[PDB]
Curated annotation (Swiss-Prot):
Complex and partners: Homodimer.
Disruption phenotype: Cells lacking this gene show a cloggy growth and do not produce the dephosphorylated and acetylated derivatives of HepGP.
Misc. comment: The HepGP product, which is the first archaea-type G1P-based ether lipid being identified within the phylogenetic domain of the bacteria, was found to be subsequently dephosphorylated and acetylated in vivo. However, HepG and its acetylated derivatives represent only a minor fraction of the total lipid in B.subtilis.
Protein name: Heptaprenylglyceryl phosphate synthase
A single GO BP: glycerophospholipid biosynthetic process
Source organism superkingdom: Bacteria
Family: Belongs to the GGGP/HepGP synthase family. Group I subfamily.
The enzyme's E.C. designation: 2.5.1.n9
Organism: Bacillus subtilis (strain 168)
SUPFAM superfamilies, per database record: FMN-linked oxidoreductases
Residues annotated for sn-glycerol 1-phosphate binding in this entry: 13, 155-160, 185, 205-206
MF GO annotations: heptaprenylglyceryl phosphate synthase activity; magnesium ion binding
Cofactors: Mg(2+)
Length: 225
């Protein structure tokens, strides 16, 4: 399959408001990555989607604003930020999407994406009013919440830093239905492989803009040559 997250191992997450050269975008789409996730305006989302769709790789929209939903993606990931103090980041995005765009929601493949933002010092933590200063125990508990709800994805999110490997391990131990996505600080093959021991899917994001060639090697590191 292509669109079953249960078989994935590696995704790149791109920021549509950041600049990536066409050539690099091409190479990334052709890298063997299991999906390209567009995530971070309707116009910049549309432009980047139209570029990625020239390739065979699954293209995913991580929906962070309803105003910026565009047709044409293979999958739509709608985050529930389980440690948000604001209901609109937990089920509000879903409800708005269903109320405003019910017919679009019916025609596309939508995935509820459990989210735990575990890095208190990132923008998303601020933006989602996340209770992000979490213990190991707190994180495992959020993971069990995702598994009780049978959310298809539990995305453990440290954004630009490396999260505690033990917390990834202990999170994985409580998940079965939930596919474990880890993102945070993955910039090279050695670290990608380290986190791939426990995460089902490793997410490589801002490293692509920081050192492209190095970030590129994360696919083979996690998927084999």
């Amino acid at each position: 399959s292509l669109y079953d997250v249960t078989e994935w191992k590696h995704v790149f997450k791109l920021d549509p408001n950041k600049d990536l050269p066409d050539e690099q975008l091409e190479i990334l789409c052709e890298s063997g990555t299991d999906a390209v996730i567009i995530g971070g305006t309707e116009d910049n989302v549309l432009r980047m989607m139209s570029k990625v769709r020239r390739f065979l790789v699954p293209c995913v929209l991580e929906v962070s604003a309803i105003e910026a939903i565009v047709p044409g993606f293979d999958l739509y990931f709608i985050p529930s930020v389980l440690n948000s103090k604001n209901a609109d980041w937990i089920v509000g995005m879903h409800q708005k999407a269903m109320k405003e765009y019910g017919e679009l929601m019916s025609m596309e493949e939508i995935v509820a994406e459990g989210y735990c933002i575990a890095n208190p010092d990132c923008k998303a933590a601020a933006l989602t009013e996340a209770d992000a200063d979490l213990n190991m125990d707190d994180i495992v508990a959020y993971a069990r919440v995702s598994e009780l709800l049978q959310l298809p994805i539990f995305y453990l999110e440290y954004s630009g830093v490396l999260g505690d490997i033990e917390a990834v391990k202990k999170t994985k131990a409580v998940l079965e239905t939930s596919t474990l996505f880890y993102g945070g600080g993955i910039k090279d093959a050695e670290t990608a492989k380290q986190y791939a021991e426990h995460a089902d899917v490793i997410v490589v994001g801002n490293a692509v803009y920081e050192d492209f060639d190095r970030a590129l090697k994360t696919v083979a590191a996690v998927k084999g040559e």
